[PDB]
Amino acid sequence: MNQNFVALTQHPGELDWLQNSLASAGQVVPAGSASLEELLALLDVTAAGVLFISLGKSNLVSQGALVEGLVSARPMLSVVAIGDGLDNQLVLAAMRAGARDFITYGARASELTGLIRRLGGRLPSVP
């Protein structure tokens, strides 16, 4: 019923869309301009299991490398990419980097709560 989510957004409209859509599921913590080390510290203190990362053609090389680093360090972390659903090569690059899912900014709130439900039902609770 409640989680912390971390978001690497490339504009404030994305952060608002995430926060408003996922309000019933938990809290969306912004990570702003964060390095891999800083981002891993923020995931640990918030005990976040889902990370949202906004991808585009301009930031794909550096952000893709970051997803690769995150997924190496935290294999159980669910990385969800946010980008243009009309760009097949972008969707493909994100998946290759280690992103579990890809959503387009402005998607219905029910699509986001649905995704969080699905990602929650994926692994056992008792460790």
Map out the domains of the chain as residue ranges. 2-127
Nearest residue to 3 (alpha-carbon basis) of 44, 38, 45, 50: 50
Q: Is-contact 97 127, C-beta < 8 A?
A: no
Token representation of residue 74: 């935290």
Q: Is-contact 94 64, C-beta < 8 A?
A: yes
The resolution in Å comes to 2.4
Residue 112's alpha-carbon distances to 4, 59, 86, in angstroms, are 14, 23, 19
Which amino acid, 46? T
**Dist CA 88 CA 46 (whole Å):** 33
- Domain covering 2-127 assigned CATH 1.10.150.120 in the classification: no
Q: Is-contact 99 53, C-beta < 8 A?
A: yes
Which amino acid, 105? Y
- Return the exposure string of 77-111: e unless at least 16 CB atoms fall within 10 Å of the residue's CB, then b: bbbbbbbeeebeebbebbeebbbbbbbebeeeeee
Give the side-chain half-sphere CA count within 13 A for 58: 2
Tell me 11's DSSP state: S
Q: Is-contact 27 5, C-beta < 8 A?
A: yes
| Residue in the block written with tokens 């019923």 | 1
Token representation of residue 101: 């899912």
